[PDB]
Structure 1
């Protein structure tokens, strides 16, 4: 396989999501959808009266539904959050300014997202492709929480005042904005709740936001496959433009990211409406891109298999990462998965490698790691594989309590 493309769509479910899903379905391709449930409540400032229909269609035709937070952090964009906030925030266009403030509350709007989904679609948890509890992406932020050793944050993703193009904008990578620092704590809170978060390698976006109908300038299918080619094995999350889209500290050649390209785009770019002739002009771009990427040797997959799901009969090499019932695991030795050797919290074949920082069972801890346990932070003094008898509060020799 030339490579595996993960085509992902943010900010639905809206009416245009239906057209996008139909094109994906026609071309035999599954997408990952990072949804904001406030479109179900009718307050997202889009064409969204068919949002519930769109949510159902994504579930019924096998796409992966993931968590993009209830209201896309726009409660942080305006004074008081209400039915008109999406409209108000679209009028100033200040989505990235003070986007993250109280990280505990901001992180909890990902939990609110799931409560709303389950109120509108009570059986949503009977769908195997519903990953609202396991997969998230932060609004505006090319930040990653994949494994204990695969993480990245965009340190310029949001600002305390100026936008990246406004004169006087500065991004000090080792003194980032308060909004960025808050978004980092949000990533960490979500990982401690079991989430993986995925950023993106390339953004399928209007290449001229200036003109009256910016959607029309969405990169042509052929040119965009050129960008996907360039993103392959080139650590594109750190080289992407503009500056607020970079992921900093990305572990460039890490094996879990090899031969993979995560594409970010938005259904609202494939709609005929306020942003231009998106449907009649960009929907054909999407269909053609799907066909020519397949023709070139690419394969399309969904973010739930980005970290391959463990399966009986598969072969693993020492160091391969899998995901098993939502938990990330690293292989201790080369082997062929047999049904009794599933990863677990006491398996000697697999260790837990969740990107979480709370003390966890069966983690291969290194000296210098820091874990959180019963509200306290502990430094790991001595490398060890954690186990239930070795909790930090008692193992005064393996761990040292901090602050």
Structure 2
């Protein structure tokens, strides 16, 4: 009977600072989820990153989950031509969020480049069960979600075509958002069709003021931050969160998978003594205190791969329960006790596939109004039905109509 589940997630590693963050976590047995960019492994990410490969190894060997944050954090969209100094050059101008997404197909493909680079530096990385780079992602700058067919959100103010959010003159038009936001959405949809889930966050453990001379020194204290977590528990934090560009618009408040869960976003580089402040000296103790008080307050920690629980032999499932099985999201059709010979599948009558994907897919519960893509063409679902191999969109003229 825990008060809730916290998902500690760390963005933008692997860097030298990741090693200290992991050792703090390890001292208390907590597992984190790390959303890595492989450009630190190549030494072009403008951080202290000579130990990036040791950090990647440490994360995997001590049981933390590694997920896909893209190769270079979309920095290629921040400069005219991407190269070894694009990182520092984009740091100099601070325009990370300006035209952050441009060509969605290419931007998505940098999530796959990420995988290739990981495997070049750590060639046996897919022999690790806690390596999830092919299945779990998070978009840079974007509190966007792709969890189930019916659990999606987009961060409609996350990135801009011109003005930064705080800057005088900034308007975010939700009914017609920035071109960069529009591309980020297509990127979400592209990753979901390759089988990813993308997760945003409920709370962003960040500087209480990004304007003071050493911003890392103003990271929220642990007591105050456990307070933020308490506040977000079952209160649809992704929509209420500030600033505006951190919001997740359309988040399905009260959706069952999000009950009693808080996903915390933070960055290893905030726990480093360096160009941003006394991270290691002042904030590593804050992190270690939070881990103590959060358990005392009744929370437990988990990693994002369990956010949707894995299908288990012997569990009682209710109609409507969500699981993953071989990385695929499923929704129980019938209350029943799972057993070894009837796991979810593309022909199971006990489950339907509920991936957040939009390509036409077997054993999906389709609704009137859904749109599916099949053999390069888009089709509207006219009639609710569970899809099967006899009823491919191109030949079933009753259940589907081509958009043309």
Fold shared by both chains (TM-score > 0.5): yes
Q: C-alpha deviations, 1:6-45, integer Å up to 9, x for none?
A: 0000000000000000000001100000000000000000
SS class of match (1:18): helix
Structure 1 match to 2:287: 286
Partner of 1:15: 16
SS of structure 1 residue aligned to 2:391: coil
Q: Deviations over 1:54-112 (max 9, x none)?
A: 00000000000000000000000111100000000000111000000000000000000
Deviations 1:328-381 (A, max 9, x none): 000011111100110000000010000000000100111111000000000001
Q: Structure 2: how far apart are the matches of 1:389 and 1:108?
A: 33
Q: Which residue in the other structure is 2:320 paired with?
A: 319
Q: CA deviation at 1:389?
A: 1.5
Q: Which ranges of structure 2 fall in alignment gaps of 5 or more residues?
A: none
**Which runs of 5 or more structure 1 residues have no equivalent in the other structure?**
none
Deviations 1:157-209 (A, max 9, x none): 00000000111100000010000000000000000000000000000000011
Distance across 2 between alignment mates of 1:61 and 1:99: 33
Shift in Å, 1:397: 1.3
CA deviations on 1:308-333 (whole Å, 9 max, x unpaired) are 00111111111000010010000011
Shift of 1:390: 1.0
- Distance in structure 2 (CA, Å) of the matches to 1:364 and 1:185: 23
How is 1:4-403 mapped onto 2 (pairs within 5 angstroms)? 4-403=5-404
| TM-score between the two structures when normalised by the length of structure 2 | 0.99
CA distance in 1, matches of 2:366, 2:176: 29
**2:22 & 2:390 partners in 1: Cα distance?**
49
1:150 deviates by: 0.2
Secondary structure of the residue aligned to 2:35 is strand
Corresponding residue SS for 2:389: coil
Could you state the TM-score of these two structures normalised by the residue count of structure 1? 1.00
CA-to-aligned-CA distance 1:280-324 (integer Å, 9 cap, x gap): 110000000001000100010000000000111111111000010
Structure 1 residue ranges, 4+ long, deviating more than 3 angstroms after superposition: none
Give the Cα–Cα distance (whole angstroms) in 1 for the partners of residues 99 and 386 of structure 2: 40
* C-alpha distance in 2 between matches for 1:131 and 1:251: 25
Q: 1:113 Cα shift?
A: 0.2
How far apart, CA to CA, are the structure 1 residues paired with 2:307 and 2:21?
22
Q: Alpha-carbon deviation of 1:210?
A: 1.1
SS in 1 for 2:301: strand
Distance in 2 (CA, whole Å) between partners of 1:51 and 1:217 is 26
Report the secondary structure of 1:378's partner residue.
strand
CA distance in 2, matches of 1:152, 1:368: 18
Aligned residues: 403
Aligned equivalents of 2:311, 2:281: Cα separation in 1: 41
Question: How far apart in 2 are the matches of 1:315 and 1:207?
Answer: 44
Q: Deviations over 1:124-158 (max 9, x none)?
A: 00000000000000000000000000000000000
Q: 2: CA distance between counterparts of 1:105 and 1:140? A: 17
SS of 2:7's partner is strand
| Aligned-pair Cα RMSD in Å | 0.5
What is the CA–CA distance in structure 2 between the aligned matches of 1:67 and 1:129, rounded to whole Å? 12
Corresponding residue SS for 2:139? coil
Greater mean deviation of Cα atoms: 354-363 or 333-342 = 333-342
Partners of 1:99 and 1:264 lie apart in 2 by 19
